[PDB]
Symmetry: none
Subunit: 369 residues, 3 copies
């Protein structure tokens, strides 16, 4: 094993803990962080891009009556205009004095160039964590992809390795995150079914290959002038051509604590946070080297080769095999662990004398520086 030691969140840093048991030889505990990956609960709901106005051909007639009927399309604003084309010299070659009408329909479908470049609207929430922690506990060297939580246990080398929930619940992604090419921004997209021509959500869709649209691009039908058969309207300039200016905060460049961001999975890599409380049920079989076998005598220690950031650990014992050696102070960490009589290690300390260890034992050592 029952153990539990605090282990922070900083890659490339070898961690060393110590087992202070009575009887059995104090084991070595080396753990290294390779690369962290934090992926929140991604829930795809909407997508957007450019569009193309699909204005049909008017069905101008004579003294006959007309009233448009709605159906199931994108955008719906139809108005019957009366009084246009008062004569044959007007444009439509009409014979009526003042009883003429038009349908004037106008919708907007997804453009052809939208299939490739797009934007995926999502609502980032309850972020999950998974850190592949290196494991070393003797002669074995296993690397496992472990989920960071106090619910999912391990196995590795007949051991129950638990990641444990970090005390830092800080996510670099807020409530809503939309994708762009291969970047990640913090966007304040409008509510579904409450769109506005204020940009940032024109004719939004469910996915890449959808078939149900909804929108309000401030479209208004205008009464044409008597000259030539035309269909003049005052449309709002697409906001997607203007969003390439007010983009701003890219997040990828404003990475907090050297953190990172992924494209496809929208994950945060190499991001330092808090501490990971690891607990492992190390059995009797792992505590190799009982008090009945190893019996090291007097410990000696002297320093020689040392430069800015072998300690002569000559011992005398019976039969080579294993032999755990670890530091006991607050400074100067060794490089290797299990090295059998004429032991050979190395350190990297300032000038104070140390001890560690190796193992057990222790020592310390030394230184140188």
């Amino acid at each position: 094993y029952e153990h539990a030691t605090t282990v922070p969140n900083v890659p490339q840093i070898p961690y060393k803990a110590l087992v202070e048991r009575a009887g059995y030889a104090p084991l070595n505990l080396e753990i290294t962080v390779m690369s962290s990956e934090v992926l929140p609960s991604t829930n795809q709901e909407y997508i957007t891009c450019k569009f193309t106005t699909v204005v049909p051909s008017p069905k101008i007639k004579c003294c006959g009556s007309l009233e448009c009927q709605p159906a199931a399309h994108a955008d719906y604003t139809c108005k019957v205009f009366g009084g246009v084309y008062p004569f044959m010299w007007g444009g439509a070659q009409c014979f009526c004095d003042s009883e003429n009408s038009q349908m004037s329909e106008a919708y907007v479908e997804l453009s052809a160039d939208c299939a490739s470049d797009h934007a995926q609207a999502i609502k980032v929430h309850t972020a999950a964590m998974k850190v592949g922690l290196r494991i070393v506990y003797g002669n074995t060297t296993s690397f496992l992809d472990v989920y960071v939580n106090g619910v999912t246990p391990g196995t590795s080398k007949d051991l129950k390795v638990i990641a444990g929930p970090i005390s830092a619940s800080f996510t670099p992604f807020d409530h809503k995150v939309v994708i762009h090419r291969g970047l990640v921004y913090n966007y304040d997209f409008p509510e579904y079914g409450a769109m506005k021509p204020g940009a940032f959500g024109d004719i939004q869709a469910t996915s890449l290959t959808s078939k149900d649209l909804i929108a309000s691009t401030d479209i208004r039908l205008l009464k044409p002038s008597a000259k030539n058969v035309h269909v003049p309207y005052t449309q709002a300039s697409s906001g997607f051509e203007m969003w390439k200016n007010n983009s701003g905060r890219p997040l990828q460049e404003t990475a907090p604590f050297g953190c990172k961001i992924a494209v496809n999975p929208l994950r945060a890599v190499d991001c330092s946070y808090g501490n990971i409380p690891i607990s492992i049920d190390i059995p009797n079989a792992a505590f190799i080297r009982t008090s009945d076998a190893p019996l090291v005598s007097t410990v000696k220690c002297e320093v020689s080769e040392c430069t800015y950031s072998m300690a002569t650990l000559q011992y005398v014992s019976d039969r080579e095999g294993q032999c755990p050696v670890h530091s006991h102070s607050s400074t100067a960490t060794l490089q290797e662990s299990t090295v059998h009589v004429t032991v050979h290690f190395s350190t990297a300390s300032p000038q104070a004398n140390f001890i560690v260890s190796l193992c057990g034992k222790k020592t310390t050592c030394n230184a140188e520086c």
Copy 2:
């Protein structure tokens, strides 16, 4: 390296500098001066020597008129004399009473013996420098002819060796230097086109095989006496036969600081002056013997054989190879540098204990003386 150490101008003196870097082994820097050569900007302009008067034959006539015409030769002073040879009993067997004239021409061409012995007038100026500095930095022994200036870099052994401009701008040659046989004097020769019979520049020429002369040897035509056809003139005795007395200052014997002088290139050899600031961009590859390989222990030192101007440097290390050893005081310089366990050197000091170283380480040582 970026290094730079001061190195004086005295041949046959081994120079030893020290690299005080953090980490890598402090390298050895041996540099020796072989022979210095200082050649100024030589600009050949004029040459001189003996000459031979070329007096032609007079064209004496009778009662006819005469007036000489100038051309393009050396020296030009012609005067028509009237009243000479008043009768047939005078000399030229003339029939005129008092209407007789002569041309009387006289020029001076370069002698036949001038082709070999000569004198070359030059205007010594902006002196250049070139000193072949010996280079040693390990197992290599290269000798290069390097120009002494902070503009022309080097190569030698993958290193950028710079000579650097000396702080002493003293030249043994002044403004004008003329050659004689195989000697070098400081002469005050007259201005080109302003010659005078005051010697030191009679009928000067451009080079050895020229064809355009200019001069003024104070030549004057005199009216001959009526007796025999002659052409008597009062010429100035050549100054080149008199300059073998007022030569004086030979410079070669009054050599400043044991300096020398050359004949053909007019160069100053073995001439001590100031200091040569050398700077070399020594790369990582040259700094052999990192802190990870050599690990010499306790240093011991004792003196034995020493006479007026081996130090037992027994060491214990792993594997022979290189091993830089250098002095650290102000007196007692070693003879050799890189010598591998039972090291064997030698010194030449008075009686104090020196250093150381070796290397690195250281020491010191010782011484012885």
Copy 3:
């Protein structure tokens, strides 16, 4: 012378000196400066302009070995690349797995457009002087091109006119002057054989029709990518296309004291400086009008016609001929000199009364114013 009077350096200004001899008539001395010309010792050494990279065709092979050999060209950086084109689908249709190499050569020759537009590097030094001084001393009016120095004498009108060295040794050209089209700048060009890609001296040459080059335009060979047979390099943009901005100081516009500058001879014209000490050995024959011939009586003087900047000099003598008349005060200079009984001159003074013267014487015158 034996005379000598100080004469300054300002063109279009008539100079008037006075001979104060005992006995003979005091002569008039008029001297005018036409146009000054100062040409320093021009020593052509280097020239520059645009260039064209001459990258040859690669000699890609198979599993055969390769090592490039240097010769005698401009620029020399060749590197054998290995590991490129691992397959037939790579680019060169190779059959080798990982044993393939290339030569990759690249030099730089003088461009075709360099023949006309160029730049001539020179080292301006010991400036010479030559001023064509007008000469008047009676009935003669000779104009001679005389060198300004106390070494080269004259002749003019049976007189030994000496220019004399000016007390002002100020040259508008400093140590180095390079030509551009038809302008003259003060440039700080690098040392010969110590060129750098810092511009102002890329691939310099001896002259216009040379055949020996030297340079270092920071050229570096890069390992190509496996796709299509190419030779990609990172070259430094020529400094000669950028020097049309940092040109600055043109000198021609910043002419000191209304001075000038020439194109072909690099001369300074109409440039005022100091004083020119002229000395002339005027013989007895030039001092016309002895005390035995002219005998002018009582001098009378009255002023009439005078405007802002004839003085009735009625005399009575025997026989017209010459007659030198000159001013004796510090203001009011005459226009003419030798004018015979009813003399007629003219002046240009303020309001003060003068004598113153014329011559011688015276016165014064016046015034016015």
